[PDB]
């Protein structure tokens, strides 16, 4: 018939298994043999049975990304589980070193800046519906975000850099760790530019229904009530926008014009220029959003399934209100076990008082840093919390459970089921946020496009398939 139909140029490939024997367990032979290539070429994105991901690359900061959460307290549990998991890695490294002659300490800091000026992110991801308009973000969300540091910042001691060009801020305590770096990123017209809000990321969801909103402006927080207020306040703001609840447009003429200045002023009197031509203080912006959020709660429909409860939002708003009254009155005694920058500042002030120290005293720098050391009993946050000087949002029991067990209300529940079977059956599997694949014998794939669903019959078939060939 048709001779031109034969594919004379065709794609082809061979897969060959090799018999591996060692002549004097053997499992130790295979492991040492695979080691060089595994460490060099394996993917750096590592998914673990609690549904979370670790990003580990020998030239990069280690990063922990929580599993998908549908509830505020649950999110807190899983973020704290990350600190436990990362700390355990450090502890095990110290021991393997100690087994060798070499001894010393491994430190992991959860903060946003290092002695050399390097930046470290703590990023938020929020699912929103295609319902919410592009425009609203700049108008409504953004002004809240620029000032949110007043309520949730982790604090840092700022030293002027003599080689810095174009601007100088004096030696001083800032409520925010991130603000100067955020300013640089936004100001940059080069590859160095970092946008504060990004709606265009791969949604890790069905693209039609769902957008993923990625926010870079927040500090890494230690105290559980500070994480709760940071994420909690933001959740309420998103709901009000989604509900068209009447949050006024606060839109700023230039988003970063005041961001560094707000950081230096704990009275919140910093003045921002609205695109209106009008001006408001950072505190006034927060008081506006707070008052509207307080009215939202009165009409907030209770979620029928999972979600964050009205009772829990009332705890969020209670702390929110108390913090604004403290910034306004200048009296922090009601908030000073809950808010990172305040807790830290209170300790720094005791040291200054007692030792008559200056703000650049190495002793203070040690407080500012070791507050962020995640090692239980060594780190300053751990000591404070153990003595009752930092209040709890959640419990140790819940954090411990989240270390090995995935969220049971979301897609992560399914990823967790797959990984646990893989561990027990001994079968290799490859997962990501959406795509889940068994590599052998035949490559069975499943795509989980709905991040809200903890039920899929395809996943049940996949797990039985694995069980069949174990």
Ligand X SMILES: Nc1ncnc2c1ncn2[C@@H]1O[C@H](COP(=O)(O)OP(=O)(O)O)[C@@H](O)[C@H]1O
Q: Is 55 annotated as a binding residue?
A: yes
Which range, of 88-96, 126-134, 291-299, 431-439, touches Mg ion by CB under 5 A? 431-439
Residues 9-68 that bind ligand X (CB under 6 A): 11, 13-15, 45, 53, 65-68
HSE toward the beta carbon, residue 136, CA cutoff 13 A: 20
Single out the residue of 117, 131, 249, 363 in contact with a second copy (rule: CB under 8 A). 131
Q: State which residue, 212 or 391, has the beta carbon closest to ligand X.
A: 212
| Residue 175 interacting with a second copy (CB under 8 A) | no
Please give the size of the binding site for a second copy, defined by CB under 8 A. 143
Q: Taking the complex as a whole, how short is the minimal distance between the CB of residue 416 and a second copy, in angstroms? A: 13
Angle between the N-to-C axes of helices 396-404 and 72-99, in degrees from 0 to 180, rounded to the nearest 10: 70
Please choose which of Mg ion, a second copy, ligand X, none residue 5 contacts, taking the beta carbon within 5 to 8 angstroms, the exact cut-off set by kind.
a second copy
HSE toward the beta carbon, residue 212, CA cutoff 13 A: 17
| Residue 262 interacting with a second copy (CB under 8 A) | no
Check if the beta carbon of residue 403 is closer than 8 Å to that of residue 64: no
Single out the residue of 170, 277, 426, 457 in contact with a second copy (rule: CB under 8 A). 426
Q: Is 433 annotated as a binding residue?
A: yes
Residue in this structure with the two tokens 């609840």, named with its chain if needed: 245
Angle between the N-to-C axes of helices 310-329 and 142-152, in degrees from 0 to 180, rounded to the nearest 10: 70
What would the two tokens of residue 132 be?
């919410």
Distance CA 72, CA 297 (A): 16
Under 8 Å CB-to-CB from 455, ≥6 apart: which residues? none
Q: State which residue, 272 or 316, has the beta carbon closest to a second copy.
A: 316
Please give the size of the binding site for Mg ion, defined by CB under 5 A. 1
Please choose which of Mg ion, ligand X, a second copy, none residue 189 contacts, taking the beta carbon within 5 to 8 angstroms, the exact cut-off set by kind.
none
Under 8 Å CB-to-CB from 463, ≥6 apart: which residues? 417, 418, 421
For 271, list phi and psi in degrees, rounded to 5: -100, 130
| Residue 420 interacting with ligand X (CB under 6 A) | no
Which range, of 30-38, 260-268, 330-338, 348-356, touches a second copy by CB under 8 A? 30-38
Check if the beta carbon of residue 399 is closer than 8 Å to that of residue 80: yes
Least Cα distance to 469 among 436, 434, 444 occurs for 444
Q: Is 53 annotated as a binding residue?
A: yes
Distance CA 46, CA 430 (A): 10
Is 76 exposed, middle or buried (CB count within 10 Å of its CB: 0-12, 13-18, 19+)? buried
Q: Taking the complex as a whole, how short is the minimal distance between the CB of residue 307 and a second copy, in angstroms? A: 3
Binding mask 34-53 for a second copy (x = CB under 8 A): xxxxxx-xxxxxxxx-----
Torsion of Cα atoms, 245 then 248 then 254 then 256, to 10°: -60
Task: Clarify whether 57 is annotated catalytic.
Answer: yes
Please choose which of a second copy, ligand X, Mg ion, none residue 363 contacts, taking the beta carbon within 5 to 8 angstroms, the exact cut-off set by kind.
none
Single out the residue of 209, 284, 306, 405 in contact with a second copy (rule: CB under 8 A). 306
Tell me the H-state helices in 166-309: 179-187, 224-243, 259-263, 282-299
Binding mask 344-383 for a second copy (x = CB under 8 A): ----------------------------x-x---------
What would the two tokens of residue 424 be?
């027990």
Torsion of Cα atoms, 175 then 178 then 181 then 184, to 10°: -80
Q: State which residue, 45 or 309, has the beta carbon closest to ligand X.
A: 45
Check if the beta carbon of residue 124 is closer than 8 Å to that of residue 215: yes
| Residue 431 interacting with ligand X (CB under 6 A) | no
Least Cα distance to 185 among 169, 197, 203 occurs for 197
Single out the residue of 80, 451, 463, 466 in contact with ligand X (rule: CB under 6 A). 451
Which range, of 68-76, 258-266, 314-322, 395-403, touches a second copy by CB under 8 A? 68-76
27, 57, 180, 255: the active-site residue: 57
Q: Is 315 annotated as a binding residue?
A: no
For 340, list phi and psi in degrees, rounded to 5: -50, -55
Residues 153-212 that bind ligand X (CB under 6 A): 201-205, 210, 212
| Residue 246 interacting with a second copy (CB under 8 A) | yes
Please give the size of the binding site for ligand X, defined by CB under 6 A. 23
Q: State which residue, 2 or 353, has the beta carbon closest to a second copy.
A: 2
Distance CA 296, CA 412 (A): 30
Single out the residue of 156, 211, 260, 300 in contact with a second copy (rule: CB under 8 A). 300
Distance CA 447, CA 433 (A): 9
Q: State which residue, 268 or 416, has the beta carbon closest to a second copy.
A: 416
Q: State which residue, 283 or 431, has the beta carbon closest to a second copy.
A: 431
Q: Which residues bind Mg ion (CB under 5 A)?
A: 439
Give the annotated binding-site residues for ATP: 53, 66, 433
Residues classed as catalytic: 57
Q: Which residues bind ligand X (CB under 6 A)?
A: 11, 13-15, 45, 53, 65-68, 125, 127, 201-205, 210, 212, 433, 439, 443, 451
Give the annotated binding-site residues for Mg(2+): 15, 55, 63
């Amino acid at each position: 018939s048709t001779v031109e139909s034969a594919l004379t140029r065709r794609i082809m490939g061979i897969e060959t298994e090799y018999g591996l024997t060692f002549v004097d367990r053997p499992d130790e032979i295979a492991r040492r043999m695979f080691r060089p290539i595994v460490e060099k070429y394996s993917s750096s994105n590592i998914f673990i049975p609690n549904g979370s991901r670790l990003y580990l690359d020998v030239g990069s900061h280690p990063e922990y990304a929580t599993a998908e959460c549908d509830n505020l307290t649950q999110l807190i549990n899983f973020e704290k589980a990350g600190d436990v998991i990362a700390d355990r890695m450090a502890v095990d490294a110290e021991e393997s070193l100690a087994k060798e002659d070499i001894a010393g300490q491994v430190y992991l800091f959860k903060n946003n800046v290092d002695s050399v000026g390097n930046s470290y992110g703590c990023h938020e991801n929020y699912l929103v519906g295609r319902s919410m308009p592009l425009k609203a973000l700049g108008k409504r969300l953004m002004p809240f975000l620029i000032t949110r540091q007043l309520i949730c910042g982790a604090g840092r001691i700022h030293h002027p850099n003599p080689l810095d060009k174009g601007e100088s801020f004096p030696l001083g305590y800032c409520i925010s760790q991130r603000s100067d770096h955020v300013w640089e990123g936004v100001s940059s017209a080069t590859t160095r530019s970092r946008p504060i809000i990004n709606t265009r990321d791969e949604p890790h969801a069905d693209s039609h229904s769902y957008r993923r909103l990625h926010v870079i402006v927040g500090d890494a927080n230690m105290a559980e009530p500070s994480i709760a207020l940071k994420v909690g306040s933001t959740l309420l703001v998103l709901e009000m926008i989604e509900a068209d609840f009447g949050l006024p447009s606060l839109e700023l003429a230039n988003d970063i014009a005041s961001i560094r200045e707000i950081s230096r002023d704990a009275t919140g009197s910093t003045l921002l220029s609205l695109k209106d031509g009008t001006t408001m203080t950072a505190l006034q912006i927060q008081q506006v959003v707070f008052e509207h959020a307080s009215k939202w709660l009165e009409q907030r429909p209770e979620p029928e399934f999972s979600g964050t409860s009205n009772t829990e939002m009332a705890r969020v708003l209670d702390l929110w209100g108390r913090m604004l009254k403290a910034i306004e009155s200048g009296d922090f005694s009601e908030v000073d076990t809950e808010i990172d920058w305040v807790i830290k500042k209170k300790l720094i002030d005791r040291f200054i008082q007692r030792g008559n120290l200056g703000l650049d005293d190495p002793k203070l720098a040690q407080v500012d840093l070791t507050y962020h050391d995640i090692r239980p009993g060594r780190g300053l946050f751990s000591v404070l919390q153990s003595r009752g000087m930092i209040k709890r949002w959640t419990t140790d029991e819940a954090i411990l459970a989240a270390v090995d067990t995935a969220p049971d209300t979301t897609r992560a529940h399914l990823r967790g089921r797959i990984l646990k079977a893989a561990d027990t059956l001994g079968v290799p599997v490859t997962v990501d946020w959406m795509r889940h694949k068994v590599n052998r014998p035949e490559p069975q794939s499943v795509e989980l496009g709905d991040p809200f669903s903890a039920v899929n019959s395809e996943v049940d078939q996949l797990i039985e398939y694995m069980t069949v060939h174990a």
